[PDB]
């Protein structure tokens, strides 16, 4: 129903207005790198 469309964390408000899928985002496994500074992230060439 419409209430089931609107209610819950998978509903419209919580699942599509408070938070949503975004463009220009990546996700992958993290590995250490002691040779990077603290403000620096190593990025794969395919993601970039």
């Amino acid at each position: 129903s419409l209430k089931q469309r609107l209610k819950g964390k998978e509903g419209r408000v919580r699942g599509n207005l408070m938070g949503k899928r975004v463009d220009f985002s990546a996700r992958t496994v993290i590995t250490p790198d002691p040779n990077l500074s603290i403000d620096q992230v190593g990025v794969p060439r395919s993601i970039a």
Binding site: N35, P44, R45, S46
Partner: protein, 115 residues
């Protein structure tokens, strides 16, 4: 997927300089030799052969990142000497060392084989 080709650790691509020199402006008579597509082998021997030189005040090398293939050798010498000349003399001494070691190894193999 993001795996680099295995020849990229030792092959210079087009437009890549092998060795570049930069003057280190912090202290006088200091230079940064950036050598591309080399690793701890040449960096270590050049570092130690520079350490044998008494006119060399500082000698060191680093790999800035092990996933890149680059050696930074910083050489600081006395004001009556040059870091470029120190680097050249170190490579010349290492070449003479390896020639002498090669001829003695050949003599030793010949002596071992003849009995």
């Amino acid at each position: 997927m993001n795996a680099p080709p295995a020849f990229e650790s030792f092959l210079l691509f087009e437009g890549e300089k092998k060795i570049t020199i930069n003057k280190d402006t912090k202290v006088p008579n200091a230079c940064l030799f950036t050598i591309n597509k080399e690793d701890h082998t040449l960096g270590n021997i050049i570092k130690s052969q520079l350490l044998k030189d008494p006119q060399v005040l500082f000698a060191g090398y680093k790999v800035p990142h092990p996933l890149e293939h680059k050696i930074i050798i910083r050489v600081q010498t006395t004001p009556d000497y040059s870091p470029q000349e120190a680097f050249t003399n170190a490579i010349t001494d290492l070449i003479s060392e390896l020639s002498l070691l090669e001829e003695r190894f050949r003599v030793a193999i010949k002596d071992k084989q003849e009995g």
